[PDB]
Amino acid sequence: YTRVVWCAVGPEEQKKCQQWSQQSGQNVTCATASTTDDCIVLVLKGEADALNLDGGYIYTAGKCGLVPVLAENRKSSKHSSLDCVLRPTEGYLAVAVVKKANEGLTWNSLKDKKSCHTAVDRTAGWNIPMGLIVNQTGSCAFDEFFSQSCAPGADPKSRLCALCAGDDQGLDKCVPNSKEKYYGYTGAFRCLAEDVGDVAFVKNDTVWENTNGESTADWAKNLKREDFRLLCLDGTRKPVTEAQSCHLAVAPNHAVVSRSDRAAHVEQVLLHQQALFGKNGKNCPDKFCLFKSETKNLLFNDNTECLAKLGGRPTYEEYLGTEYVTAIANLKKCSLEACAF
Numbered sequence: 001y002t003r004v005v006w007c008a009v010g011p012e013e014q015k016k017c018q019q020w021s022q023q024s025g026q027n028v029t030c031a032t033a034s035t036t037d038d039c040i041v042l043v044l045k046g047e048a049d050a051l052n053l054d055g056g057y058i059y060t061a062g063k064c065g066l067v068p069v070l071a072e073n074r075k076s077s078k079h080s081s082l083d084c085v086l087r088p089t090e091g092y093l094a095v096a097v098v099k100k101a102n103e104g105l106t107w108n109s110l111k112d113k114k115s116c117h118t119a120v121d122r123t124a125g126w127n128i129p130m131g132l133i134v135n136q137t138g139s140c141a142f143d144e145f146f147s148q149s150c151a152p153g154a155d156p157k158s159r160l161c162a163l164c165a166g167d168d169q170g171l172d173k174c175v176p177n178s179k180e181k182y183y184g185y186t187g188a189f190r191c192l193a194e195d196v197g198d199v200a201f202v203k204n205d206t207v208w209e210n211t212n213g214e215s216t217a218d219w220a221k222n223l224k225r226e227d228f229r230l231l232c233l234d235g236t237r238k239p240v241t242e243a244q245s246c247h248l249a250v251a252p253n254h255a256v257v258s259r260s261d262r263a264a265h266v267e268q269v270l271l272h273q274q275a276l277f278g279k280n281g282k283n284c285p286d287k288f289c290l291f292k293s294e295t296k297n298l299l300f301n302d303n304t305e306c307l308a309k310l311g312g313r314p315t316y317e318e319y320l321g322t323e324y325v326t327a328i329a330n331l332k333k334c335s336l337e338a339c340a341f
């Protein structure tokens, strides 16, 4: 009865969640929904307990009363061995990536080009770049900025979905889940790699994890970091090695959210689950690994070292940071006392 019901977004996450359920002796069970928003609703209804969310979604969930529980913490050597679970998160770098061969393309010549986004409402893939663009063009018509895009979650018949490809069969074009070929960090980077789009709004880690043999996936196998460039806000282009001096923003880390009344129980179960299936986990590589799914970033990002305890029991606004919260509210003024549900 102590059981935590995880919410999986789409069939692939559902399959991984089921594997996790089996290996956890049903200490974790699965609820599945087609989109992250639907999962948030299941949690609000009490039909699911938790799921790991990108900051843009933490904002949506938070307005609905859901809270931060634990955050993804990426192998980053700083904070010596203050162990992982106790190490404070540093956030990730949201970047704009283009092909080096696409010369002359800069942050200042993005209008009318083709873009690849992780998903509508996500932090590196949407909130940050579109916020910056609405800001600079002084206009809310962000649906008109890029000539075509793949922005999972947007209207499928719109130009924002024109570049999306759907699943092996063309079904689910533009759905905001892994069934869409170009969905998420890896999908948006793939959209760029395959030259479907001119620019990809992802995070620094994505570029590294899908180049120079780091991915053995067929579209990624042959990719070289030097064939890519980051777009700096000052109009310059730099090597992906320059991320720290050429990013759009620093993003909150993805984090597990739950209803406030279930947060303590979810935290407890998760800490026990990663002890078993996390990076150095007792049953990881071996029976199951919570943080692996072949660069597909299912349930959690594949580069997650551990889920870390938060500092000073954050409200969702403290967790996301005042800078980011303001940016989202300002951007959403184009589409304050919320919960869209």
Ligand SMILES: *[C@@H]1O[C@H](CO)[C@@H](O[C@@H]2O[C@H](CO)[C@@H](O[C@H]3O[C@H](CO)[C@@H](O[C@@H]4O[C@H](CO)[C@@H](O)[C@H](O)[C@@H]4O)[C@H](O)[C@@H]3O)[C@H](O)[C@H]2NC(C)=O)[C@H](O)[C@H]1NC(C)=O
Pocket: 075, 076, 077, 093, 204, 205, 206, 208, 209, 214, 241, 242, 243, 244, 303
């Ligand atoms: C941009 O994002 C990348 C990827 O997240 C950052 O680069 C990573 O930096 C980490 C340290 O800050 C490196 O972590 C360790 O990874 C392994 C652990 O075994 C060590 O060797 C590696 O072996 C693996 C597997 O064969 C390879 O993927 C690596 O090439 C590497 O040789 C490594 O010494 C280190 O201790 C991590 O490797 C590294 N990842 C990659 C793919 O380069 C980068 O810092 C970040 N930039 C910014 C500005 O944040």
Ligand SMILES: *[C@@H]1O[C@H](CO)[C@@H](O[C@@H]2O[C@H](CO)[C@@H](O[C@@H]3O[C@H](CO)[C@@H](O)[C@H](O)[C@@H]3O)[C@H](O)[C@H]2NC(C)=O)[C@H](O)[C@H]1NC(C)=O
Pocket: 127, 128, 131, 132, 135, 322, 323, 326, 327, 330
């Ligand atoms: C695009 O839209 C607006 C244009 O400025 C941006 O919102 C503004 O963001 C700044 C920076 O976070 C806010 O400034 C802050 O002011 C508060 C007090 O007013 C202070 O506590 C902070 O130290 C900081 O100085 C500013 O308030 C905010 N303004 C309003 C009225 O919303 C937005 O950030 C831009 N979008 C992006 C993605 O950059």
Ligand SMILES: *[C@@H]1O[C@H](CO)[C@@H](O[C@@H]2O[C@H](CO)[C@@H](O)[C@H](O)[C@H]2NC(C)=O)[C@H](O)[C@H]1NC(C)=O
Pocket: 002, 023, 024, 025, 026, 027
């Ligand atoms: C399901 O969860 C329970 C704990 O809530 C796991 O079992 C206990 O774990 C502690 C510490 O890890 C052990 O010291 C206890 O003795 C375990 N209880 C017993 C009675 O075995 C339990 O193993 C989990 N189930 C699986 C299959 O992972």
Ligand SMILES: [Fe+3]
Pocket: 054, 055, 122, 123, 124, 251, 254
């Ligand atoms: Fe994100």
Ligand SMILES: [Zn+2]
Pocket: 247, 249, 250
């Ligand atoms: Zn910065």
Ligand SMILES: [Zn+2]
Pocket: 312, 313, 314, 315, 318
């Ligand atoms: Zn506080």
